[model samples]
Target chain A: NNSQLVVSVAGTVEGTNQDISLKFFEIDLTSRPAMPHKLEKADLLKAIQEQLIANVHSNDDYFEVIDFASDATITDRNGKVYFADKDGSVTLPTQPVQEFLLSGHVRVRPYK
Target chain B: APSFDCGKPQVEPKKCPGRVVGGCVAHPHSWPWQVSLRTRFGMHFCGGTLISPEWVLTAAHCLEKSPRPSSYKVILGAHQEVNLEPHVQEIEVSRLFLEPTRKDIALLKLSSPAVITDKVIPACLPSPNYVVADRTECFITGWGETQGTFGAGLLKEAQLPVIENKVCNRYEFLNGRVQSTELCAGHLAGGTDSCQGDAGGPLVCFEKDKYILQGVTSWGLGCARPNKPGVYVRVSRFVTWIEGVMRNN
Candidate 1:
């Protein structure tokens, strides 16, 4: 039943030896007061996308992301590539893709 | 035109008398609304502006660094920092309301209301349309240094032209961090700015025989550094927010 139980991801996982300072965020899954199976990569992203409309802090800065990105794409160690869809979630690639790119590029005072 | 009481106690401020370095020693009682925020240990640091006899306006960052208000003390009508007991009315902050996000603004509620006096009065809050024009002359007063880290002891006043939000954003030091809720005021050529120990002070504009507070001292990379103007919480935009905080609790 795992075949029919397939899950889709909106972001991609990092390739080996490639470190990306990308958008990383955290969000809670229940504003409706009751929900199920938000442990998936898709559900977490959806929760954040919704809750980001207002600031909701849970447990002492435990849920704040330092980066975000637009026009983000993903290429794997195996050479397969795909564009990150802002709306449509994808399950095309055989390898499990996780994580999105988010960079504010917020650097402090410029060099002389 | 702001609806709050203004041009009171010390009505129609004159241009600063002395020029030390963009800032000069303020003749006593020139700025009536200025408050010297002190800690329980009796150390005078930071500043606050009175908006109402019971409410004091300041930077949210100031309370963030020093969260507990029970130990905080405020001295109004204080010209000299060291000996502030005379004209300075000592009071304590009872509650604090912090604005969300890049808006570094906060309202401090004094447990006991300040007695409105010739020296202790609330500064005016501007209307939404009265956005302080860029290059308009405004004043920043504090116990901050006239030059460098040295405390002037006496409150120092400076004439800084309000820099346009666009011009302020152009500074490489800001890195586009300037928000509409914030603005810059200083010499573009570098010099004449509110520096250390001046955080939470008011940036007042002399308009129509009244002093309207346009901003509050928030942050900067360095004191009077070129292309590094002092950042302030724009007071006009948050007029409604300020009123809401004062009303509900």
Candidate 2:
């Protein structure tokens, strides 16, 4: 099913003020739970956080912000916001996203 | 061309235990031979069936957009169209072979032999002149479109009843379009059939103790529409040609 959307996330590192962009990758929301369905903002936010966290860790060669602050404010270019809490629970659309941005002093730290 | 048995998947479809509907999420890697034919950009556009470790069978029309071998990638042992799977093997296409008669059939030579695993196997080609009986219960699987969209995302499968060529051709929309080299199968009601992205995928029928690839998803008037059954490139019609391509190439 080629309908899955390709997405990427971008955020600013706290100390260095370095902006990091993760590589775009495909997301599968169709098989969620059991059957094919559309994306939800909450579910999408969750996936972005998961992918962002993994991407940050995997791309340590370029940067070393393995984790983000639990209270860091993250938002997409469209104004949707999330607290960036690992313990928190995300989607806005099933469309391709060139870069879903993290707004506000988008904190990136060594640990959170 | 490697010596290996075909059609025997390590994961049994029934052992996974799911009932067939118009289409539903297939258990991951259940249909091991099923493939995701993707563009170099990682966009999936068609489906394919692995007939060997080095070869994949798909529809010739799929190449009309990007005919170069480097322009395509073949994903094996995959269930979800885009999600990362532990057993997934993404390989580049090294060569392309279109049928001599210009039948809507093609074979892709993989850049490297796939590592056969429980989740990776080749589909069995139908025997010469192997006729799938009318109304025979067969399954069509693909990440094809659902609900009028481009993709279902998850591999979807439906149990379609095979229709005789004459009966299939009788439909006004499909009158005389069901060629002898093709097979028709679908629910006359229209809610259960393959869609756009499914082209070149296998129309597999369970024969004997294993599944045999009977058809290749070809064309239809409108997906799952009443009176417009899906037409498939009858695999039985190209077995010799396929074997020759695999053997000589």
Candidate 3:
């Protein structure tokens, strides 16, 4: 399964004007029949955001993650905002529209 | 910066592991940051130190023979080389960052984050420009060769005294070859040092109740030979580079 989603999050480091970007790929979008709960949008976003937060928090000894929340508004090439509720079911994009912009507002600060 | 405590292992050291020619089997899990870098076939090669949950510090030379990340694996919390207990975590290496200057130091980014436990922890990094006093006693742990034709399946440790750069440079074998970014440790009279298979291992010093990484085992004229102390890549000189790679990735 080569289906992939590019997740890019842009944010600012608190107490300084420095900007940062966290990027990672998500590949496990398929459903498992054995599991009870379906993977909702919030579930995917939460898992993705947490991982991004961890990547920043652990490697950067000078700064730490303060807050990170996903913006669920996915805009297609048609300029239409693809809206979905946090817990709503995820719909796979059509062919040629393989990108999923998972933007999040993240705040980080110098380590105390 | 989640601020996890480093250089502190939960396991207690046994009364004494003893020594021969001066080196002994280390207490299991005592040096939690010690790691076994292996090939995909599970063959142990060089040693490395866990510096963060997903990053490892090792010698740049270790990867020269096999540069592919997918060809190697990292074993954490293991006392033995092959028979892994439930505590062991075998993870793939996703990427490697070598110091551009080819300074004998490198970093590996794990495929996934490692779970820190009593048997696993990261060693502390020394401050930039940190220097250990000459003759300071420090520890080196690895699963390297214990003697000619005999290899250690279990972890081993040895305490070696830091050799002053001036004195170490005077050795006929090394002869002014030791750089400022490298360090020398072990007996001038020999019989105590890191050996084959110990490359990339940590040369750590106990400081302020924490073990700070002083060097990365680099080379030696010969294993425990007279006047040929172990040479290591001084870690303090490359702290900035290490931190930069960790931050950007």
Off by over 4 Å in 2: A1-112, B1-4, B14-22, B146-152, B189-197, B219-222
Candidate 1 lDDT by residue in tens digits, B1-249: 333355454534545521123344465677888877778777776788898888889877678557788878888887667766465788888887888755577889998998777777888889974567887887787877632112236576766677788878874656687888788776654343345337888888878677888888884332444567777888888888889889988
Tens-digit lDDT track of model 2 for A19-96? 556555656444455113334434544555566566555445333332222223334455555322111223334454
Model 3 chain A worst lDDT window (10 residues): A30-39
Chain A TM-score, structure 2: 0.40
lDDT score at residue B179, model 1, on the 0-100 scale: 82
What interface Cα RMSD is found for model 3?
A: 26.5
Candidate 1 docking: what grade?
Answer: incorrect
Model 3 docking tier (incorrect/acceptable/medium/high): incorrect
| lDDT of every model, 2 decimals | 0.60, 0.66, 0.68
Query: Chain B TM-score for each model?
Result: 0.87, 0.89, 0.90
> After best superposition, candidate 1 residue A33: deviation in angstroms?
90
| Model 1 lDDT per residue over A1-112, tens place | 1111111212211111112222344322232442221233244344444443343355212222211112122333443433223232322332233332221211111112
Candidate 2 C-alpha lDDT tens digits along B1-249: 554368876666632111122243455677889988999989888889999999999998888877689999999988656565776999999999999885589999999998888788888998887778898877777877542111235566666678888888884647887778888876564332345338888888887878899988883332444578778888998999999998998
